[PDB]
């Protein structure tokens, strides 16, 4: 009910419009790579809650290696959480009674999230018959990404490359 309150009680002009962090970060990374000789070594995969069961917008950086006739792919996962409300407290069971325990961003990254990311990665490369996929790292980005954040994008790309290699 309350999830669609804005559609029920609507207004023409809204003060909150949101942003496109995944579009901004992907654009910066591709712009950096377009002049070097490693244009074709990386694949960027966008996962958003509108089509996959994930809690935050994420970007995946993929690269491959071939042994014999088989292909192996490795990915680095980057959830972007700037601008979202913080997590509420969870009620647990104690020896005396009930307690409320704090949570943070990482507490939402469970097995379902891993399964969804793997499915997106497999759809990116072509299918199960086109290779094998594995996760190589994970990091949460808590600061906003704008069109003037080239340095941060370059640093993140370097970290992903080192982990994959």
């Amino acid at each position: 009910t309350m999830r669609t309150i804005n559609r029920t009680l609507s207004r023409r002009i809204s003060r909150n419009t949101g942003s496109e962090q995944v579009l901004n970060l992907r654009r910066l990374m591709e712009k950096y790579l377009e002049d070097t000789r490693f244009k074709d070594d990386f694949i960027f995969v966008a996962v958003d809650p509108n089509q996959y069961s994930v809690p935050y917008p994420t970007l995946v950086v993929m690269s491959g290696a071939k042994v014999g006739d088989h292909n192996h792919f490795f990915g680095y996962v980057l959830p972007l959480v700037a601008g979202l409300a913080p997590l509420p407290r969870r009620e647990e069971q104690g020896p005396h009674g009930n307690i409320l325990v704090p949570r943070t961003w990482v507490d939402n990254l469970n097995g379902t999230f891993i399964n969804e990311v793997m499915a997106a990665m497999y759809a990116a490369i072509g299918g199960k018959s086109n290779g094998t996929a594995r996760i190589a790292g994970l990091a949460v980005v808590t600061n906003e990404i704008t069109a003037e954040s080239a340095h941060l994008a370059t640093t993140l790309l370097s970290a992903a490359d080192n982990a994959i290699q």
Binding site: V106, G111, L138
Partner: peptide, 6 residues
């Protein structure tokens, strides 16, 4: 759980 996640 995070350590054994992947």
């Amino acid at each position: 759980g995070a350590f054994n996640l992947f």
